[PDB]
PDB file of C-alpha atoms and ligand atoms in Angstrom:
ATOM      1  CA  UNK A   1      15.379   5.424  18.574  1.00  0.00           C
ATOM      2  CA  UNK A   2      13.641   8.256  17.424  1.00  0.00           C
ATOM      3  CA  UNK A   3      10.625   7.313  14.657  1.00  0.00           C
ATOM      4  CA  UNK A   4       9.446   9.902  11.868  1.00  0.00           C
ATOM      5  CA  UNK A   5       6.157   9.391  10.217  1.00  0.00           C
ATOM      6  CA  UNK A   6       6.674  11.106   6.691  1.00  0.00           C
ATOM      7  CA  UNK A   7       3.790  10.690   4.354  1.00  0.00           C
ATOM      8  CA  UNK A   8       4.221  11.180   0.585  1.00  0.00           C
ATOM      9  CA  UNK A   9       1.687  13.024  -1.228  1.00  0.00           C
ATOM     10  CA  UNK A  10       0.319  14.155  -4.607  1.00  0.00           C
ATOM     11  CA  UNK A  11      -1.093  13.823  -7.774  1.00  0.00           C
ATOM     12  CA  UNK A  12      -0.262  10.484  -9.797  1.00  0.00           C
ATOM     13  CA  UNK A  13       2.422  10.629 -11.773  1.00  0.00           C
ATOM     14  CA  UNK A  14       4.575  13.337 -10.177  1.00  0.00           C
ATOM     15  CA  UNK A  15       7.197  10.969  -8.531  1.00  0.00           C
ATOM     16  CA  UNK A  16       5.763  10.050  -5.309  1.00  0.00           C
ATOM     17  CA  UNK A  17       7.271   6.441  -5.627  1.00  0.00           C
ATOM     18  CA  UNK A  18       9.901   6.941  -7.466  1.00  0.00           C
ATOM     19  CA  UNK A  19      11.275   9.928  -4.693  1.00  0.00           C
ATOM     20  CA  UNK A  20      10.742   7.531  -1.619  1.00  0.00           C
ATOM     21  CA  UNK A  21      12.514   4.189  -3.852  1.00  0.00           C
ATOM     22  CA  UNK A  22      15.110   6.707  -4.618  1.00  0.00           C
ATOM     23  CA  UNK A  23      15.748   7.683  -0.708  1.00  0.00           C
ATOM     24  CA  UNK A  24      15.510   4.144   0.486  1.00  0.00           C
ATOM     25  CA  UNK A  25      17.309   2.097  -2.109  1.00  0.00           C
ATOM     26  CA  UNK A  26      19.124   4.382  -3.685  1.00  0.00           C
ATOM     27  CA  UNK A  27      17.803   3.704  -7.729  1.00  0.00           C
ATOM     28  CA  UNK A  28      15.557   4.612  -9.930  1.00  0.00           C
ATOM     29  CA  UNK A  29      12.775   2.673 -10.904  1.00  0.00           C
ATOM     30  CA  UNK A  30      11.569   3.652 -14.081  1.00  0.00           C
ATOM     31  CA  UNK A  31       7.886   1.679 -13.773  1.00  0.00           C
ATOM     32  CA  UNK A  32       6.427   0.989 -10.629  1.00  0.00           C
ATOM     33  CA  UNK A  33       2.420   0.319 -10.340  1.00  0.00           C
ATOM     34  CA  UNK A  34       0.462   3.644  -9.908  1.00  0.00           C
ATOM     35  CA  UNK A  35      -2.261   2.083  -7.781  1.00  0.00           C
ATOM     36  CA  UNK A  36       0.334   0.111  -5.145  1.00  0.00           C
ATOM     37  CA  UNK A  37       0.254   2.210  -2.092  1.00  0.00           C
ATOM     38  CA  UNK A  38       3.021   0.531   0.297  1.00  0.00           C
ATOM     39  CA  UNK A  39       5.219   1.909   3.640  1.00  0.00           C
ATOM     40  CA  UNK A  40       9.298   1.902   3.807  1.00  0.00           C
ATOM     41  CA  UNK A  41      11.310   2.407   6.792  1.00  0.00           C
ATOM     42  CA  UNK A  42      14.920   3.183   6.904  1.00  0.00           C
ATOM     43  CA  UNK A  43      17.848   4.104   9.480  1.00  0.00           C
ATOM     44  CA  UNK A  44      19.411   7.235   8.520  1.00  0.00           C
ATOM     45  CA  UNK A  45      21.564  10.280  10.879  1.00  0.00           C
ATOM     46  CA  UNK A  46      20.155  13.505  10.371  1.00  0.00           C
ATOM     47  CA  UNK A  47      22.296  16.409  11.670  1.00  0.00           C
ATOM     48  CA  UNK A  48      23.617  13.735  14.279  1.00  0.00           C
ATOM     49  CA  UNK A  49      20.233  11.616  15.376  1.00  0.00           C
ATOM     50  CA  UNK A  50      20.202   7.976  13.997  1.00  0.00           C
ATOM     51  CA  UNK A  51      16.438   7.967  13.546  1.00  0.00           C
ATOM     52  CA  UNK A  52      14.006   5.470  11.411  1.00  0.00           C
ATOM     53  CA  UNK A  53      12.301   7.314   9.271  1.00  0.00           C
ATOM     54  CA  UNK A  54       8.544   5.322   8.315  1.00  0.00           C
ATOM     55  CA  UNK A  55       7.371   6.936   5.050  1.00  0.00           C
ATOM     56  CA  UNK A  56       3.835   6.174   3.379  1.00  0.00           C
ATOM     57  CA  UNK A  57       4.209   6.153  -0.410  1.00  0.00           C
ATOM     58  CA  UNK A  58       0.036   7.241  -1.099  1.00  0.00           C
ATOM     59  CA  UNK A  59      -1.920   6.218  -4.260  1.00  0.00           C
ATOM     60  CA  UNK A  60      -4.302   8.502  -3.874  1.00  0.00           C
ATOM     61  CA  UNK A  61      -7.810   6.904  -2.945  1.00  0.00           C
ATOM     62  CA  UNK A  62      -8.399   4.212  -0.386  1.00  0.00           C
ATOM     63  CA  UNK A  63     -10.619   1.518   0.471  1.00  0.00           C
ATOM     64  CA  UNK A  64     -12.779   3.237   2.824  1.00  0.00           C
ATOM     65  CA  UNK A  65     -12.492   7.239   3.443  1.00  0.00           C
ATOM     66  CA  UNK A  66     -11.603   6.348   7.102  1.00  0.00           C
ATOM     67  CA  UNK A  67      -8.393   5.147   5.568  1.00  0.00           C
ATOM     68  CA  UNK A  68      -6.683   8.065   4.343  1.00  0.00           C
ATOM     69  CA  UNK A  69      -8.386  10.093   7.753  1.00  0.00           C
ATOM     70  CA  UNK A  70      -6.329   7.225   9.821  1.00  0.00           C
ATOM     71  CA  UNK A  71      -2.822   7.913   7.788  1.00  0.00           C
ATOM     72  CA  UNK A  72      -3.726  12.528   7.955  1.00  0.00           C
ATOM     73  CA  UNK A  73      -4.149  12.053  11.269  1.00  0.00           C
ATOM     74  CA  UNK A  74      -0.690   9.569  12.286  1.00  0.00           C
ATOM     75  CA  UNK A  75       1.090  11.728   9.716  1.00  0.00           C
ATOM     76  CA  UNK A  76       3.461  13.607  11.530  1.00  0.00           C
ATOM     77  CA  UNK A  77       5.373  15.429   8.386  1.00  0.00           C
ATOM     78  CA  UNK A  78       3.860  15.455   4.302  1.00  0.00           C
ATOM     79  CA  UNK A  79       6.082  15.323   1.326  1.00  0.00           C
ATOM     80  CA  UNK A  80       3.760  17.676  -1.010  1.00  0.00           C
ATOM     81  CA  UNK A  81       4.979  16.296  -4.379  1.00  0.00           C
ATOM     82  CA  UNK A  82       4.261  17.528  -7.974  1.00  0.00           C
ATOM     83  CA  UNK A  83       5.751  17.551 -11.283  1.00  0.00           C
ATOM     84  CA  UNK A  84       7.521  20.372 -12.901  1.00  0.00           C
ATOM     85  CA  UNK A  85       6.158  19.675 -16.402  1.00  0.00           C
ATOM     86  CA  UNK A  86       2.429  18.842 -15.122  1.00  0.00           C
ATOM     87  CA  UNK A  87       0.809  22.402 -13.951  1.00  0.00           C
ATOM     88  CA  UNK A  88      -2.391  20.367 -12.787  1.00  0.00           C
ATOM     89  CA  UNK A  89      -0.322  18.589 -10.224  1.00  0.00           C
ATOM     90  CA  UNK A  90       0.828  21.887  -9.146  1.00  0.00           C
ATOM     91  CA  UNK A  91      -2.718  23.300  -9.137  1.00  0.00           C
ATOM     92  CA  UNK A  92      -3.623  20.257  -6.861  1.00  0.00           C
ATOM     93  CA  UNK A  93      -1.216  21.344  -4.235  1.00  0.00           C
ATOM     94  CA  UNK A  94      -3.906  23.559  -3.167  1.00  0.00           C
ATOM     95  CA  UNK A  95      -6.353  20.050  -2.632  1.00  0.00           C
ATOM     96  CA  UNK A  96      -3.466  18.560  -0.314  1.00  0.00           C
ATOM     97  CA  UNK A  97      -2.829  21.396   1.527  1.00  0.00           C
ATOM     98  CA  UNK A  98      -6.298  21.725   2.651  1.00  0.00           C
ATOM     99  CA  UNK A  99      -6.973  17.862   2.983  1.00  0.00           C
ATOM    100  CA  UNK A 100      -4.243  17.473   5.255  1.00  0.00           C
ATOM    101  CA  UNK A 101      -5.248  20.573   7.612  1.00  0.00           C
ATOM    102  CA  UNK A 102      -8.372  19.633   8.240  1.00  0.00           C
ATOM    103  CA  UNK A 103      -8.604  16.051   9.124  1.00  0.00           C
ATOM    104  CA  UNK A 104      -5.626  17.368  11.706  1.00  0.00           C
ATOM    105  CA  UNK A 105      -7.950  20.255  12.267  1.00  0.00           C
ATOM    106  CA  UNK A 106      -4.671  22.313  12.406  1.00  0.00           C
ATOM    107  CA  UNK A 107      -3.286  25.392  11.081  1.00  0.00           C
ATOM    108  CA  UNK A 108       0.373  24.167  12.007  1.00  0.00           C
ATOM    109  CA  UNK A 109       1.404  21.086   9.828  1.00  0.00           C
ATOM    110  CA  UNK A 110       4.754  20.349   9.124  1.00  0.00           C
ATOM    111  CA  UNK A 111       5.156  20.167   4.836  1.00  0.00           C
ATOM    112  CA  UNK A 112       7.792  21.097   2.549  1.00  0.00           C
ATOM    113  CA  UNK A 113       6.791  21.460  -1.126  1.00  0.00           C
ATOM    114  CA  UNK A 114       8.789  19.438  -3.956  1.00  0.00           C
ATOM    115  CA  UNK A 115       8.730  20.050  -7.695  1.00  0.00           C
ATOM    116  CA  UNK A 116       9.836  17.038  -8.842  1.00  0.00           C
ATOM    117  CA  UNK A 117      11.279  15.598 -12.539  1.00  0.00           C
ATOM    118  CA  UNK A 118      13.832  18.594 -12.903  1.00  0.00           C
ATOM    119  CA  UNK A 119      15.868  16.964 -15.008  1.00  0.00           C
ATOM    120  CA  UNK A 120      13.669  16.990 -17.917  1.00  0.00           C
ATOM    121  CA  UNK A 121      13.844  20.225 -20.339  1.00  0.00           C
ATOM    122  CA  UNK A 122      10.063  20.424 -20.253  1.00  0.00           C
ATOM    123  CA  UNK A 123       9.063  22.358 -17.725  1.00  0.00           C
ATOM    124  CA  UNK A 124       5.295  24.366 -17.629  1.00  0.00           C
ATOM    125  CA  UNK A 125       5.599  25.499 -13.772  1.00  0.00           C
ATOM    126  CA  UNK A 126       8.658  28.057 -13.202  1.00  0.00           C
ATOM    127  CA  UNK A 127      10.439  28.058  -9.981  1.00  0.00           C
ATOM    128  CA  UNK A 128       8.951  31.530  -9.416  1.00  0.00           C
ATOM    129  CA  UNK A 129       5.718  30.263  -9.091  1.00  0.00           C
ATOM    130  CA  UNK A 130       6.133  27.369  -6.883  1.00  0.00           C
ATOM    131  CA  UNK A 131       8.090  29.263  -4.719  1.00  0.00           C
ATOM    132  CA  UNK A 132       5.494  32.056  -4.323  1.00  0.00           C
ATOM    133  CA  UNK A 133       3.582  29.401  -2.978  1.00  0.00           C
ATOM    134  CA  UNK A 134       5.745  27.915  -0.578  1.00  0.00           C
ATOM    135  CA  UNK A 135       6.045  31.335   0.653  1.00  0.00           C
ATOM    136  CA  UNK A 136       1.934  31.759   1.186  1.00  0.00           C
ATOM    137  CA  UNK A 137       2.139  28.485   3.002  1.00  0.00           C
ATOM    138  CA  UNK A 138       5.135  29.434   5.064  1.00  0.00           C
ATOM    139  CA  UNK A 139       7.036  26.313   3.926  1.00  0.00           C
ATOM    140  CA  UNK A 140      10.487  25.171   1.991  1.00  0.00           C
ATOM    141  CA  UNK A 141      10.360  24.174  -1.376  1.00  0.00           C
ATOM    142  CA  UNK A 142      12.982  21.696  -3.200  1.00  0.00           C
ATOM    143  CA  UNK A 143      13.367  21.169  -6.801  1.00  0.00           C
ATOM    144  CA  UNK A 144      14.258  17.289  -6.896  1.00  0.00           C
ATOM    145  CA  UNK A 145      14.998  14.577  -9.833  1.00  0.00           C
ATOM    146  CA  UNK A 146      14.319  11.043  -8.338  1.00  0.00           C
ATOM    147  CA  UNK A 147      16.414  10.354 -11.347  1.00  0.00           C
ATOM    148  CA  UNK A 148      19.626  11.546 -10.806  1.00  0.00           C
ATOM    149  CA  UNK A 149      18.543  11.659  -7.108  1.00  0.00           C
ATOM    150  CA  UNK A 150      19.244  16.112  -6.547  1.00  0.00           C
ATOM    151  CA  UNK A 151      17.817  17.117  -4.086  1.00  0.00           C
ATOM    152  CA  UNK A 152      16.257  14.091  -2.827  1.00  0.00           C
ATOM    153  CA  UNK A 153      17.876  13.605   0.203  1.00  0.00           C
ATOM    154  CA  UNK A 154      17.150  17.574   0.768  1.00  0.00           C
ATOM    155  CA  UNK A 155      13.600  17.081   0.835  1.00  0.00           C
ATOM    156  CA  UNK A 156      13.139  14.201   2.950  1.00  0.00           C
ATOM    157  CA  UNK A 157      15.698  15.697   5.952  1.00  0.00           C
ATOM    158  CA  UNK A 158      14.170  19.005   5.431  1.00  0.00           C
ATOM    159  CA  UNK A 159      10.989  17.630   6.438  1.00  0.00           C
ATOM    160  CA  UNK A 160      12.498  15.805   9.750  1.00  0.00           C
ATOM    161  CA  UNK A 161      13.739  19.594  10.267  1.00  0.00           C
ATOM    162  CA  UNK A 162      10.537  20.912   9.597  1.00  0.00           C
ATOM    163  CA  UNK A 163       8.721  17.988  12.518  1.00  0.00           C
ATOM    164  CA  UNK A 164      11.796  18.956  14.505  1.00  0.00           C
ATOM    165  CA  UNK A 165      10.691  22.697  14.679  1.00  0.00           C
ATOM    166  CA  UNK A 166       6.926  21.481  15.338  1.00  0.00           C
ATOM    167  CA  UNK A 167       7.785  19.403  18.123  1.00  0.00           C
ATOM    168  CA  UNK A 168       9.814  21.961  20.328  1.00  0.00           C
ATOM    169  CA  UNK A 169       6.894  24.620  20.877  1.00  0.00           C
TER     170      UNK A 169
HETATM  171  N1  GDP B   1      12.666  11.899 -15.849  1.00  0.00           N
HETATM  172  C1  GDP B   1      12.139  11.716 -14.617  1.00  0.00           C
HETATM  173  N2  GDP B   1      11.134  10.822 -14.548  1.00  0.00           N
HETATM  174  C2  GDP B   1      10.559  10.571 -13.344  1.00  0.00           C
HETATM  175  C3  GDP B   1      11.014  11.263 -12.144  1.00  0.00           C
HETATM  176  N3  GDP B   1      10.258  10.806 -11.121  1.00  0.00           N
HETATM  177  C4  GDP B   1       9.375   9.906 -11.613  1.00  0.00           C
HETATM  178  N4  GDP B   1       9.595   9.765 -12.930  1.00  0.00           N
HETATM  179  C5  GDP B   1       8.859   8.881 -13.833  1.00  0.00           C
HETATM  180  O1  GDP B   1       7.495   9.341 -13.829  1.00  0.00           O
HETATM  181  C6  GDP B   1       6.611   8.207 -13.889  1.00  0.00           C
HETATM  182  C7  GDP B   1       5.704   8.196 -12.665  1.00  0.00           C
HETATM  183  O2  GDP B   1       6.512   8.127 -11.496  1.00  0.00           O
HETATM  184  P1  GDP B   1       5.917   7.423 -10.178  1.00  0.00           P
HETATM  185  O3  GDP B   1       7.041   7.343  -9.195  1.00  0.00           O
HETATM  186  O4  GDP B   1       5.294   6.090 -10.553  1.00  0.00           O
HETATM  187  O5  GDP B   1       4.765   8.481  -9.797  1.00  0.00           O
HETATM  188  P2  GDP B   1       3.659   8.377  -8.643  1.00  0.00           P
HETATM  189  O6  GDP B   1       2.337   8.040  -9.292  1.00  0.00           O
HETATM  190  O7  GDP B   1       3.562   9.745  -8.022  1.00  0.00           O
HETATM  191  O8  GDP B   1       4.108   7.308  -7.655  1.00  0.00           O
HETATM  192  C8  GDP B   1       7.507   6.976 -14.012  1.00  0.00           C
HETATM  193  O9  GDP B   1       7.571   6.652 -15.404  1.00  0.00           O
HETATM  194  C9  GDP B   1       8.881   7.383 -13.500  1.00  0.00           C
HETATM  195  O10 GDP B   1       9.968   6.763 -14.187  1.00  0.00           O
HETATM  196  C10 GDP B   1      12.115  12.222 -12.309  1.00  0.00           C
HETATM  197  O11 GDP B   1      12.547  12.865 -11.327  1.00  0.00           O
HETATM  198  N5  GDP B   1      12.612  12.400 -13.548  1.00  0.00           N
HETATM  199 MG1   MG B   2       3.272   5.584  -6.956  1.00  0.00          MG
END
């Protein structure tokens, strides 16, 4: 069956674990170790395709650098996560983005940009300015709470859309 490797990315703290716990086991996990980097896989239909989906929960760095060049470069799709109340994991963004294209060494990556923790009422990054972003990058961007799990499901699919648009040129 059809395999998509989704990687998970972003600053600590924004959600990255909570967002993929959320997709495959459907709660929330209020405290999960910031330094445990670990891979899920799940069986899901997607617009009509039973597919696995293999997603890489990242803690940010690794062993060796020839770690996170091994998972950039497998990657097929990037969940580019940050929180809405926490504008230095928006500024970071900018780090990911960059990372990511050049251990591809390509200008075409599938990403979709997430805001995550939109259920809380703080908030220091308006949707404005994330989606001015998303529209430099030429990429979708999802507001998602891993808490009461909106939009999650919108994100991860939209990034399956987003490998499924790669793959066909
Ligand atoms: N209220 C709220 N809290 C969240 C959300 N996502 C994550 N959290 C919390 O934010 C903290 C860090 O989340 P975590 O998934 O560990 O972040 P990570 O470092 O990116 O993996 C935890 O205390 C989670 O309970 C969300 O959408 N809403
Ligand atoms: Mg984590």
């Amino acid at each position: 069956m059809t395999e998509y490797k989704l990687v998970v990315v972003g600053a600590c703290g924004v959600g990255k674990s909570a967002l993929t716990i959320q997709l495959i086991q459907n709660h929330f996990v209020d405290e999960y170790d910031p330094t445990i980097e670990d891979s899920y896989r799940k069986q899901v239909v997607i617009d009509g395709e039973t597919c696995l989906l293999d997603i890489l929960d990242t803690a940010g760095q690794e062993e060796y650098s020839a770690m996170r060049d091994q998972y950039m470069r497998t990657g097929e799709g990037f969940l580019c996560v940050f929180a809405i109340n926490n504008t230095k994991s928006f500024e970071d963004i900018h780090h990911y983005r960059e990372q990511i294209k050049r251990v591809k060494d390509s200008e075409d990556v599938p990403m979709v940009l997430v805001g995550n923790k939109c259920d809380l009422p703080s908030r220091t990054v308006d949707t404005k300015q994330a989606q001015d972003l998303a529209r430099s990058y030429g990429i979708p961007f999802i507001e998602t709470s891993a808490k009461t799990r909106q939009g999650v499901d919108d994100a991860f699919y939209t990034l399956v859309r987003e490998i499924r648009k790669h793959k066909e040129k």
